[PDB]
Every structure is written in structure tokens, then in C-alpha cells.
Motif scaffolding. Structure first.
Motif, PDB file in Angstrom:
ATOM      1  N   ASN A  16      16.411   4.107  13.442  1.00  0.00           N
ATOM      2  CA  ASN A  16      15.307   4.358  12.515  1.00  0.00           C
ATOM      3  C   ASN A  16      14.412   5.544  12.907  1.00  0.00           C
ATOM      4  OD1 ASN A  16      14.536   1.875  10.259  1.00  0.00           O
ATOM      5  ND2 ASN A  16      16.265   1.591  11.666  1.00  0.00           N
ATOM      6  N   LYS A  17      15.023   6.718  13.057  1.00  0.00           N
ATOM      7  CA  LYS A  17      14.318   7.903  13.545  1.00  0.00           C
ATOM      8  C   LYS A  17      13.741   8.815  12.453  1.00  0.00           C
ATOM      9  CE  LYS A  17      17.122   9.361  16.637  1.00  0.00           C
ATOM     10  NZ  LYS A  17      17.302   7.996  17.205  1.00  0.00           N
ATOM     11  N   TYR A  18      14.014   8.509  11.191  1.00  0.00           N
ATOM     12  CA  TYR A  18      13.427   9.281  10.096  1.00  0.00           C
ATOM     13  C   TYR A  18      12.172   8.564   9.643  1.00  0.00           C
ATOM     14  CZ  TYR A  18      17.711  12.070   9.781  1.00  0.00           C
ATOM     15  OH  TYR A  18      18.763  12.916  10.054  1.00  0.00           O
ATOM     16  N   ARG A  20       8.246   8.711   7.611  1.00  0.00           N
ATOM     17  CA  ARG A  20       7.309   9.383   6.718  1.00  0.00           C
ATOM     18  C   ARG A  20       5.914   8.774   6.855  1.00  0.00           C
ATOM     19  NH1 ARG A  20       9.662  10.911   1.466  1.00  0.00           N
ATOM     20  NH2 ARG A  20      10.348   8.727   1.292  1.00  0.00           N
TER      21      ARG A  20
ATOM     22  N   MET B   4       0.309   3.883   6.316  1.00  0.00           N
ATOM     23  CA  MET B   4       1.631   3.314   6.108  1.00  0.00           C
ATOM     24  C   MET B   4       2.709   4.272   6.608  1.00  0.00           C
ATOM     25  SD  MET B   4       3.513   2.133   2.574  1.00  0.00           S
ATOM     26  CE  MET B   4       3.372   3.793   1.920  1.00  0.00           C
ATOM     27  N   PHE B   5       3.643   3.739   7.381  1.00  0.00           N
ATOM     28  CA  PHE B   5       4.771   4.516   7.859  1.00  0.00           C
ATOM     29  C   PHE B   5       6.052   3.979   7.239  1.00  0.00           C
ATOM     30  CE2 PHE B   5       2.994   7.085  11.405  1.00  0.00           C
ATOM     31  CZ  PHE B   5       1.704   6.591  11.377  1.00  0.00           C
ATOM     32  N   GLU B   6       6.844   4.875   6.660  1.00  0.00           N
ATOM     33  CA  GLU B   6       8.188   4.534   6.228  1.00  0.00           C
ATOM     34  C   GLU B   6       9.145   4.962   7.325  1.00  0.00           C
ATOM     35  OE1 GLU B   6       9.554   6.457   2.665  1.00  0.00           O
ATOM     36  OE2 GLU B   6      11.296   5.115   2.495  1.00  0.00           O
ATOM     37  N   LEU B   7      10.060   4.074   7.705  1.00  0.00           N
ATOM     38  CA  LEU B   7      11.064   4.368   8.725  1.00  0.00           C
ATOM     39  C   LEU B   7      12.471   4.019   8.265  1.00  0.00           C
ATOM     40  CD1 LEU B   7       8.308   3.217  10.277  1.00  0.00           C
ATOM     41  CD2 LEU B   7       9.721   3.726  12.297  1.00  0.00           C
ATOM     42  N   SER B   8      13.428   4.863   8.633  1.00  0.00           N
ATOM     43  CA  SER B   8      14.819   4.605   8.312  1.00  0.00           C
ATOM     44  C   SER B   8      15.771   5.304   9.270  1.00  0.00           C
ATOM     45  CB  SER B   8      15.134   5.036   6.884  1.00  0.00           C
ATOM     46  OG  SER B   8      16.497   4.783   6.585  1.00  0.00           O
ATOM     47  N   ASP B   9      16.981   4.761   9.371  1.00  0.00           N
ATOM     48  CA  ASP B   9      18.039   5.358  10.179  1.00  0.00           C
ATOM     49  C   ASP B   9      18.620   6.590   9.488  1.00  0.00           C
ATOM     50  OD1 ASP B   9      19.507   4.038   8.149  1.00  0.00           O
ATOM     51  OD2 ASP B   9      20.083   2.389   9.461  1.00  0.00           O
ATOM     52  N   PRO B  11      18.194   9.766   6.267  1.00  0.00           N
ATOM     53  CA  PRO B  11      17.205  10.613   5.593  1.00  0.00           C
ATOM     54  C   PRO B  11      16.559   9.935   4.382  1.00  0.00           C
ATOM     55  CG  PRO B  11      19.080  11.927   6.217  1.00  0.00           C
ATOM     56  CD  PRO B  11      19.422  10.512   6.595  1.00  0.00           C
ATOM     57  N   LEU B  12      15.255  10.134   4.246  1.00  0.00           N
ATOM     58  CA  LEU B  12      14.467   9.486   3.202  1.00  0.00           C
ATOM     59  C   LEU B  12      14.544  10.253   1.893  1.00  0.00           C
ATOM     60  CD1 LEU B  12      11.257   8.691   5.273  1.00  0.00           C
ATOM     61  CD2 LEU B  12      13.223   7.226   4.839  1.00  0.00           C
ATOM     62  N   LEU B  13      14.403   9.554   0.768  1.00  0.00           N
ATOM     63  CA  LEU B  13      14.245  10.234  -0.519  1.00  0.00           C
ATOM     64  C   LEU B  13      12.991  11.083  -0.467  1.00  0.00           C
ATOM     65  CD1 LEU B  13      15.014   7.649  -3.363  1.00  0.00           C
ATOM     66  CD2 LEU B  13      16.547   9.200  -2.141  1.00  0.00           C
ATOM     67  N   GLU B 110      12.218   0.462   6.598  1.00  0.00           N
ATOM     68  CA  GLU B 110      11.243  -0.409   7.230  1.00  0.00           C
ATOM     69  C   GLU B 110       9.851   0.141   6.965  1.00  0.00           C
ATOM     70  OE1 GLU B 110      11.950  -3.354   9.069  1.00  0.00           O
ATOM     71  OE2 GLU B 110      13.810  -3.017   7.938  1.00  0.00           O
ATOM     72  N   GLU B 112       5.757  -0.059   8.115  1.00  0.00           N
ATOM     73  CA  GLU B 112       4.914  -0.436   9.232  1.00  0.00           C
ATOM     74  C   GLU B 112       3.520   0.080   8.917  1.00  0.00           C
ATOM     75  OE1 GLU B 112       7.141  -2.016  11.788  1.00  0.00           O
ATOM     76  OE2 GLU B 112       5.142  -2.935  11.837  1.00  0.00           O
TER      77      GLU B 112
END
Lengths: 81, 118
Positions: A16-18, A20, B4-9, B11-13, B110, B112
Motif C-alpha cells: 500500500n505505497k500509493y 493520497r 484523510m489519507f487514501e492508500l493502495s498497493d 496507482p490511484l484514480l 484503505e 486512514e
């Protein structure tokens, strides 16, 4: 709310390194988020740019202006330990 | 405040900071088509199952105009520019869905929150 401009980051591990977040969020906020995911104490992880430790109170906007101005998304940062 | 933090493995939209009417402040939006493609669900399915998410439309040319005013987005990242007018006698539009935590989760991210003082 999450209504200001959002910056996209990519966190790379320094041995989960990306992510925003708001341009207003600070290094210390991001570090605390990271520690939660890593199940570690805040003192144990460092946030860095180009292998140099970032100040805790610096905003993402400030990092972007001073390190990433006009460069393509995502903003590349490191975390350690 | 409560960041608010958006996290993902993965690339995000990309999201866009827009004011979709004069009567409301700016906030963040995805292109609806980006969201549907990512979820592999149709509009009809999406809007029926998740009615609380806000879908709105905007003139494509106005979308470009506001996106072009972003300081963070490079020209290459912007969907369209100031030179991309719609042809005369048309109403080209884009569909947008509001950026909000429940949608981020649905997208597989995720979420957070961090509210320790800044």
C-alpha cells in the motif's frame, strides 16, 4: 471533508505505497498514518526525500513546491525502518 | 483538521478539484467513467446499488477550463486544455462522482484518518 487539492504520493522503502492526501497534511501526519499500517511506533519510521529526512511540520504542499514543482505525479518519497 | 489519507498497493484514480456550481465551494471528483472502468460495473448498477454517492455533470469545456487552472497537474496530466473548445451548437459534457471515503473503499483503497495537531 477532504475538499482542498489532493496530492498523489508514492512511498518507497529505504533499507500500500500509493498514498493520497491534502496539500495541507504535514509529514508528521503521513508518518503517523504509515506507522499505523506498519504497526510501529512513530519514532521508528522516518519520512525522507532523496534520502534526506523531512521536517515533521512541513506540509505536502511545501514539499511539492520546493522539491517537485512542475514534475509529474506522483510525488516520490521514501520511508525507513 | 481531520486529514484523510487514501492508500493502495496500486496507482490511484486521478481526482480533480472542481467547483461544479457557483453556489458551492470546490471539492474533489473522479471522472465517473474512470470509476466505472475500475469497478467494472455499469452506471445503472452503480447508481442503483450506491445511491448516496453524488453523480453530477459538467460541460466538458468547463471541466477543461477548471482543470487547466490546477497548479499541481502538469499539462500532460490534464485531460484537456484551453484550446479544446466544443464545436458550435453542441453540449459535450463529462460525468463526475464526488470524492468521498466510502467510494475510496469500494475502489479497493484503505482509508486512514489523522487528526493530531498540525
Amino acid at each position: 471533508q477532504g475538499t482542498r487539492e489532493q496530492l498523489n504520493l508514492c512511498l518507497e522503502r529505504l533499507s500500500n505505497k500509493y498514498v493520497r492526501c491534502s496539500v495541507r497534511a504535514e509529514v508528521r501526519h503521513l508518518r503517523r498514518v504509515l506507522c499505523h499500517r506498519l504497526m510501529l511506533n512513530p519514532q521508528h519510521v522516518q519520512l525522507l526525500f532523496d534520502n534526506e529526512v523531512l521536517p515533521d511540520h512541513m506540509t505536502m504542499k511545501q514539499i511539492w513546491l520546493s522539491r517537485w514543482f512542475g514534475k509529474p505525479s506522483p510525488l516520490l518519497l521514501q520511508y525507513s525502518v | 483538521d481531520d486529514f484523510m489519507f487514501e492508500l493502495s498497493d496500486k496507482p490511484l484514480l486521478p481526482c480533480y478539484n472542481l467547483q461544479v456550481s457557483v453556489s458551492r465551494g470546490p471539492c474533489n471528483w473522479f471522472l465517473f467513467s474512470d470509476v466505472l472502468k475500475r469497478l467494472k460495473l455499469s452506471s445503472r448498477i452503480f447508481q442503483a446499488r450506491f445511491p448516496h454517492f453524488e453523480i453530477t455533470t459538467m460541460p466538458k469545456a468547463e471541466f477543461y477550463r477548471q482543470v487547466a487552472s490546477s497548479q499541481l497537474l502538469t499539462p500532460a496530466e490534464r485531460p484537456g486544455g484551453l484550446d479544446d473548445r466544443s464545436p458550435p451548437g453542441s453540449s459535450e459534457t463529462v460525468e463526475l462522482v464526488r470524492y468521498e471515503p466510502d467510494l475510496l473503499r469500494l475502489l479497493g483503497s484503505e482509508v486512514e484518518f489523522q487528526s493530531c495537531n498540525s
